[model samples]
Target: ITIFSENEYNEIVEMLRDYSNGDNLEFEVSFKNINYPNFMRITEHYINITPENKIESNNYLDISLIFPDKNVYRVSLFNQEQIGEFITKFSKASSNDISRYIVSLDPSDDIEIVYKNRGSGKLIGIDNWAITIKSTEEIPLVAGKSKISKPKITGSERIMYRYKTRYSFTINKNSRIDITDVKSSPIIWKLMTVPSNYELELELINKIDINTLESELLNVFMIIQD
Candidate 1:
């Protein structure tokens, strides 16, 4: 099982949009246990954008699995209404900035909590925060005199888009915790990573199986790019 990084998640969203824009896109999600004959399958389904500004599909996204106990279990990932809502949101945000719509973390709230949770109970200082231009297009410079080395105009002036989130917090005094003492220490790590709230809601079960299912289900969406 694996967790996708921020960039990977963003790329997956873009890929999904691309696939939805195409014709006859079909995919499936399957998992096979290495140690046993137990396996799970989410049958093939077609995902396409409809004229009503929503994603519509005929088949439901359901998982059919056989456990080690030799019992078969069928689970629905999302109901029809829930899937409609999710797809509507995705379709509407396709041409606009989608990170904010998809990612659940609020930078403002996180900064406030980080400030108040400081060890000294004093306001944390903001060192630097701005959306400065990171790069801009310019004429390519060729050192060696070679006509073949000159750049050619690409199709329709390629456009690049990126959204970045940056926050800086500085503590006045330092009360560092030793690496080895962290497990036994009362002080907890101030920064924590969390999954997006838009992800699948899985019931409490075996930790190993839960992780496997989570990654497998998410990967199904991620691997739809053809």
Candidate 2:
């Protein structure tokens, strides 16, 4: 579906004009988990934009296009229709890594990251939903030229897309029982940090498998509350 319309584009342009004229606004456009109804393997689909820069003419735009599949001409003006095209084109990127979009976080959100061996693939979770990284080769990390040390994940705050599976889970429990005092809940404390020198990993599963896993995990938490 076409997300942004003429009204939306006008609104965005007006806002951008304000930023370009007055404030030094640093903004970003993101497209995560991009998907469309029907499209072939895209040869090239990307954005060529000059960020935080202004043009001499207010009528002109600072963004450009690179979608070979579309009948889009060489252009500079960013339109709502174009933004819609960009999103759909994102789904056909050669690499899944580039298809990902970044986002800022809120302090209250609980985020976690789960990684596979050598940091090859990772799953990021923000609250309940998650997105998995199929291959990190296209976009690998370099903490001052770092090496893999047991490949661990730190945080999670993203929505997953195709070629990148997503998962969501919820935990239900009574606050009174779940958040008991340390002294009152010796069993809960015992449950904490109960590791068997193993790393927990998850992946796509069948309906039965998912149900079984959900049932078992639910039982564990239920027992704690019980």
Candidate 3:
């Protein structure tokens, strides 16, 4: 069987890092060894993750990478415009013999930084579609253990930030996590948490002008508040 070369993987990583200007960002990558026909089918799923295509919409791109230690990580990034830039820049449409060309790009190259649309890619207007890529990093949870990731903000016209929570253990059945910040002025916060499917989905939304983006990642601070 023909195995893909690590050289190809390195080359792609180098290009994306350069594009994102992420010299200080830490990146983990995974390589998929499959024939082009099969890879296309895989790409189809990630490239179409959400319904709204507006430039301001949240589109996702997930990539699975293998480490030198043989550990695998499924990393997920969210963006709308950056991905379209990659697709358009390298998309030659196979006008000749090589009608299909695929390049994997990293939207999360920079740590905790979110961005907006720009340049010819913005003008070409392939800019606002959501997609999915897959990978996993272990967020440890043992009964009461929980984790929080640093909040992220992205926008042009309307500014917003997202605070997330990940639970390692399945929450008790029919129980929902409660969230509130009474210490501050009566803040109008939004809460959406789901522990129904084993994985807990918790997001706290607020305007950019409200909270200072902390360099800290969120962890399970309050698993169950009464």
Candidate 4:
């Protein structure tokens, strides 16, 4: 459900907050995915942030909502519950021609952006995960020019209610592999040339297997963005 107002929010956050305090969280035994005007033909359910816990950034996560369809999504806090993960399409506007992906994470952690693009099709890996602030009208980018309100989303529907687990995730630094020497890796030696030609792009399978943690999946690729 949309986190438009606190009154209209879901009960999941209550459970999530408990976990932030080292408690367990879970969903009802009978939870099902809903249908909406989704590109995947169904509008999956999503969660919201309460500011008490979850990912918060000075730059943006305030405007961005999570794709509800994410089951269990990333990490599980309650052994009693079982769900899926969330997925995202790369930003078309910010990523089109040498996007200066200016990210903002809490000062406690340093965030980075890493990916792979075969110049034609193949892309993969989990590099960095943060709330995006594609320049809008009121949140102006170029000084004293215009408002930066219009986001870079493509769907007819708006994603204004992204919640904690729905969008926020810690870097998989513990289990990630060291594939920097692999010739196919894309996060290497490319400037903002804007060609989408000479540079390789990521063909990612966003779900980072929890079992692998870091030794296999966390630092699986080379990170470039800081």
In terms of lDDT, which candidate is stronger, 1 or 3?
3
- Per residue, candidate 2 scores C-alpha lDDT tens digits across 1-226 of 2223455434444433443443222222211232321001110110112122211112111111112232111122224454344446544443323212211111111221122122322222222212221211122222334434421112322222211111112121200001101111112122223331111122112112223433433433332231
Q: Between candidates 1 and 2, name the one with more favorable TM-score.
A: 1
Name the runs in model 3 displaced over 4 angstroms: 1-57, 68-70, 73-75, 90-226
Q: What number of clashing residue pairs does each candidate have, in the order they appear? A: 0, 0, 19, 40
Q: At residue 11, give the lDDT of candidate 1.
A: 44
Worst 10 residues of 1 by lDDT: 174-183
Candidates in descending lDDT order: 3, 2, 1, 4
Cα lDDT for residue 204, candidate 3:
18
Candidate 2 Cα outliers beyond 4 Å, as residue runs: 1-3, 34-226
Q: Alpha carbon lDDT of residue 39, candidate 3?
A: 35
- Candidate 1 stretches with Cα past 4 Å from truth are 29-36, 40-226
For model 3, residues 71-128, the per-residue Cα lDDT tens digits are 3223333444644443355344332211111112222332222221112121111112
Top-TM-score structure, candidate number = 3
Which regions of candidate 4 are displaced past 4 Å? 1-62, 65-156, 165-226
Reference-based TM-score, model 2:
0.17
Assess candidate 1 and give its lDDT: 0.24
Q: Please identify which of the two predictions, 2 or 3, would achieve the higher TM-score against the true structure.
A: 3
Error of 4 at 55 (Å): 12
Tens-digit lDDT track for model 4 on 130-149? 21101101111332445434
